[PDB]
Amino acid sequence: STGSATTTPIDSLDDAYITPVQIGTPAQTLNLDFDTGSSDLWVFSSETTASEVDGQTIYTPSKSTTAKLLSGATWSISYGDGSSSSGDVYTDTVSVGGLTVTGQAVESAKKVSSSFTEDSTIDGLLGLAFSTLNTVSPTQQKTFFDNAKASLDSPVFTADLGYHAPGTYNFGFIDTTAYTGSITYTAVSTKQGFWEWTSTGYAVGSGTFKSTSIDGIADTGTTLLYLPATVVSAYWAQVSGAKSSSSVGGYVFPCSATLPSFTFGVGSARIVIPGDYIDFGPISTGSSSCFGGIQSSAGIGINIFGDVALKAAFVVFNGATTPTLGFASK
Numbered sequence: 001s002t003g004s005a006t007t008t009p010i011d012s013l014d015d016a017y018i019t020p021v022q023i024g025t026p027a028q029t030l031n032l033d034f035d036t037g038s039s040d041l042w043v044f045s046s047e048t049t050a051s052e053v054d055g056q057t058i059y060t061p062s063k064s065t066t067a068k069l070l071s072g073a074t075w076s077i078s079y080g081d082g083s084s085s086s087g088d089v090y091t092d093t094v095s096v097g098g099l100t101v102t103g104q105a106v107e108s109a110k111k112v113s114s115s116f117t118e119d120s121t122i123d124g125l126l127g128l129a130f131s132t133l134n135t136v137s138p139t140q141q142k143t144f145f146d147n148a149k150a151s152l153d154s155p156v157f158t159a160d161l162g163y164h165a166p167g168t169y170n171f172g173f174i175d176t177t178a179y180t181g182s183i184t185y186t187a188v189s190t191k192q193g194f195w196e197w198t199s200t201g202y203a204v205g206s207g208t209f210k211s212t213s214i215d216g217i218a219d220t221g222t223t224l225l226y227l228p229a230t231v232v233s234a235y236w237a238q239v240s241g242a243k244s245s246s247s248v249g250g251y252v253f254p255c256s257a258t259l260p261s262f263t264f265g266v267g268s269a270r271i272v273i274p275g276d277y278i279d280f281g282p283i284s285t286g287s288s289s290c291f292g293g294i295q296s297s298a299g300i301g302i303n304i305f306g307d308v309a310l311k312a313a314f315v316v317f318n319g320a321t322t323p324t325l326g327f328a329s330k
């Protein structure tokens, strides 16, 4: 089997991407935030505290003839930006882009934190990291990909995120028309539960490539590119007037600037992030200070290749017995 679904930016800055997901019978379609950095599929629901729902589409398990309470199971997750959610668990039929999993754990939110409530465009998260990170207790549950894997034509999914445009998540096949050149594959460590890999270095604009190992995660659920402070300082030094602002929480730059590209290495291959992908717009409405898309990881503890990096590539998440990642230009 295969599946293919379009993923769409939630706003004009590509702050996140939403993908329609069918849950239950008859289907209830919710727009979920596919996260390769977490491993829970959770949704706003008829169980969510009413004051914490503001415009999201909810899953109502009582209206699904295939829903079953997973008795005794609870879940609770944090996103590292201060947000979190928790609740109980059902199993139900879940389909993405024509690919159907029966008995998928659907984690129903009883509580969500404010930044969830405040974003009406995100109806929940669909985790695509390794199932060892799933938070369901006392019986850990498998991700949608883990449940689908054995049925797929090939045990892979691909992320093809658009810059200020829709893109595609495919399951079970590699669309050879969706990228240019060849795909370069690189080793993955699953020891922390992430799609963790080592970039071979970077360049800023037309500058020389610096060969240096940068361990990090391929994370569709993170908006920005978080890299070591040395690398980030080297990038922003090429933007007149850019500075790290403690009050804003990262590097900002004059909105009048033209940003240089940023290249990262995948083995001997190179992925080029155009400068425009690094512009996250005014820090507040009407400001002439703009927020940068490359930020220091110093306060996190791992480097994260978030959407800023991934949207510059066609990315293969190869879930074979020994997982690997592939990157191609597009």
Ligand SMILES: CCOc1cccc(C(=N)N)c1
Binding pocket: 035, 036, 037, 038, 078, 079, 080, 219, 221, 222
């Ligand atoms: C406490 C949450 O910490 C992280 C770290 C890295 C990735 C993610 C994620 N969900 N994409 C979350």
Ligand SMILES: CCOc1cccc(C(=N)N)c1
Binding pocket: 016, 033, 035, 037, 079, 081, 083, 115, 116, 119, 122, 221, 222
């Ligand atoms: C790692 C993904 O972290 C997310 C994703 C989507 C939304 C939010 C939020 N704060 N409302 C956080």
